[PDB]
């Protein structure tokens, strides 16, 4: 549905997060921005 | 309807009219879905290993075993079989 | 791999405590439902129970064993465990709408509840041949020292725990396991100090508490506390029912409120505490001759629960609680049991600490204070039923 | 669950006809070094 | 407990002896394949 | 504080700026301790 609680898979990065890219800091996905390269 | 006899996952009318899987869950067949790719399967409503192969009907349609086997092995009508 | 870990821990266990365990394992759901509302009967029917040795033995060979680290557990719990009465799912549906996630999401938004009774849980993520009753699975954290039996049942090296905190929720997401969907919990513990039936204890840690807070209390408004808890306290309490300050304001009890709340906001709790008060249909807005007060049918529950479960409170006047949780001839009549969660650090004092009849295991609050209600449940006394309300004071 | 590592009982062989079933085989040989890798690549054959 | 087939530890010396205790033997021999069998009998000794 | 990300019974900022043992129990540092 529309909303960014959703992880198909179960491996703890929500699917569109997979989807659109993410990075990890602190043990946690977070959402990619341009500025962390 | 709601129905899973043999509790596959797959329900009965599914089983017996025709059924895909996206998104890991089975749905309704339509004629639209073969433009897309997706193929229509059917199997076993009273048996949840329709080929009697180590693998139930849903994991062969959903492809959620072995990536090594072949695409041919996914429908429930044809065995894993070396 | 654990077969000889479970041995390692089974050899040097009792001979007791090894048949409560078999026993256990024969008849799990009694005990569990028993173990669970063991501590609101009186001392004396508490004491004569036919199942209370097994209690013992089993709550003994649970906190034999130890965690030094924290750890994950995952088990399936009913969703009404958390005050949602409606279906996310029917046990042979595959997919959970969008609005139930929705629905589910707000019931549980900032709420504490708490778990006490025995449970079967697994160290590993439930698999293929593994048992799956609920549409909910949760991920819960356990804190360091606490206790877990692994047992072998049948070849299946089964743990069991017993629970003594309140669990709150963190993140819930929308799973797939084997074609069906699943709401996933993320749960962390929030511990507590909470004295069941051993009265004794908490009568211990209130008296070296509290003992000295006498001290650090002015002669003058110590021997006015004193005087107010001893005789007039029902008189201040009818006085603040009635809104008399707004009413027919008067400086006289003015002066007594404003010196009962200073010298309980001198020394307030130093650590999260629960407390156990039985309530009366007046606090609710109900008579005595009300045909809801009568919880033995299903309807009354149900609507006393729609009406209050997760609301607010408000009482203003001073509220009266004691550690126990026993049942007393004195509120013998009273269907309705307040459990309270005391945070830390907000104000309140032992007066069973100082000498003399002060009451039983007397514990006092500031007036005006809120309440917000998380889950009520209803246990069975006798010919009649009781109802338990668990709460949380708010600042 | 410890949080020890264990060897005994995880073998790639389970793994290696998966993995090469869906990946493409990569090599740089260089000089004095030689690496070789696998890219998972995707199948368009199937919608899923 | 889940779908899989289990031989291991299932062994037919366990039931060989209580089949043949209960039961009357039947052959046919045909031409070109023989059949056996085995079909229980009643004990007409034992009221239950 | 009492952030433990890793589990491991020290909080986060005592492991950040440092910290010792006594009594089975993670304390701040002080350099009176030395
Ligand atoms: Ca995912
Ligand atoms: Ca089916
Ligand atoms: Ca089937
Ligand atoms: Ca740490």
């Not at chain 1, 990075?23 to 921005?33: C, N, P, S, Y």
């Not at chain 3, 004569?48 to 924290?70: H, Q, V």
């Not at chain 3, 005595?288 to 919880?295: A, R, V």
């Amino acid at each position: 549905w529309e909303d960014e609680d959703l992880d198909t898979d179960n491996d703890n990065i929500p699917d569109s997060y997979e989807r659109n890219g993410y990075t990890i800091k602190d043990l946690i996905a977070v959402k990619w921005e341009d500025s962390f390269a | 309807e709601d129905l899973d006899t043999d509790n596959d996952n797959i329900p009965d009318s599914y089983e017996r009219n025709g059924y895909t899987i996206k998104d890991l869950i089975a749905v309704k067949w339509e004629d639209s879905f073969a433009e897309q790719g997706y193929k229509k399967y059917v199997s076993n409503y009273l048996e949840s290993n329709t080929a009697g192969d180590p693998y139930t009907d849903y994991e062969k349609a959903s492809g959620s075993f072995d990536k090594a086997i072949k695409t041919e092995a996914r429908d429930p009508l044809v065995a894993a079989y070396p | 791999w654990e077969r000889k870990e479970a041995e390692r821990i089974e050899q040097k266990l009792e001979r007791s405590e090894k048949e409560a365990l078999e026993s256990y394992k024969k008849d799990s759901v009694e005990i569990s439902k028993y173990s669970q509302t063991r501590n609101y009967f009186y001392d004396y029917q508490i004491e004569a129970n036919s199942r209370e040795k097994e209690y013992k033995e089993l709550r003994n060979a649970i906190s034999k064993n130890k965690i030094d680290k924290p750890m994950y557990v995952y088990y399936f719990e009913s969703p009404e465990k958390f005050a949602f009465n409606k279906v996310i799912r029917t046990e042979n549906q595959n997919e959970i709408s969008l609005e139930k996630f929705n629905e589910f999401k707000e019931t549980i938004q900032n709420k504490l509840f708490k778990q006490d009774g025995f449970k079967d849980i697994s160290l590993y993520e439930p698999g293929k041949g593994d048992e799956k009753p609920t549409p909910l699975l949760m991920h819960l954290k356990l804190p360091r020292n606490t206790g877990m039996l692994p047992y072998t049942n049948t070849n299946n090296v089964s743990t069991l725990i017993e629970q003594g905190y309140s669990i709150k929720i963190d993140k819930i997401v929308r799973i797939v396991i084997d074609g069906k969907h699943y709401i996933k919990a993320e749960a962390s513990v929030v511990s507590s100090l909470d004295f069941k039936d051993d009265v004794s204890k908490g009568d211990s840690w209130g008296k070296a508490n509290y003992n000295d807070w006498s001290n650090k209390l002015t002669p003058n408004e110590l021997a006015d506390v004193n005087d107010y808890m001893r005789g007039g306290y029902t008189a201040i309490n009818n006085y603040l029912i009635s809104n008399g300050p707004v009413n027919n304001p008067n400086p006289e009890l003015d002066s007594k409120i404003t010196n009962i709340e200073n010298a309980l906001k001198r020394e307030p709790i130093p650590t999260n505490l629960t407390v156990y008060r039985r309530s009366g249909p007046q606090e609710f807005g109900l008579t005595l001759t009300s045909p809801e007060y009568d919880f033995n049918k299903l309807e009354n529950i149900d609507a006393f629960k729609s009406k209050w479960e997760g609301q607010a409170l408000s009482y203003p006047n001073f509220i009266s609680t004691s550690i126990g949780s026993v049942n007393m001839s004195a509120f013998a009549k009273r269907k309705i049991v307040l459990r309270i969660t005391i945070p830390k650090g907000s104000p309140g004092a032992y007066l069973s600490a100082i000498p003399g009849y002060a009451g039983e295991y007397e514990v006092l609050l500031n007036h005006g204070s809120k309440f917000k209600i998380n889950k009520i449940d209803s246990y069975k006394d006798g010919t009649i039923t009781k109802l338990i309300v668990d709460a949380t004071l708010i600042p | 669950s410890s949080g020890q590592i264990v060897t005994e009982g995880n073998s790639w062989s389970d793994y290696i006809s998966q993995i090469d079933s869906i990946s493409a085989s990569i090599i740089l040989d260089t000089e004095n070094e030689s690496y070789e890798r696998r890219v998972t690549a995707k199948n368009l054959q199937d919608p899923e």
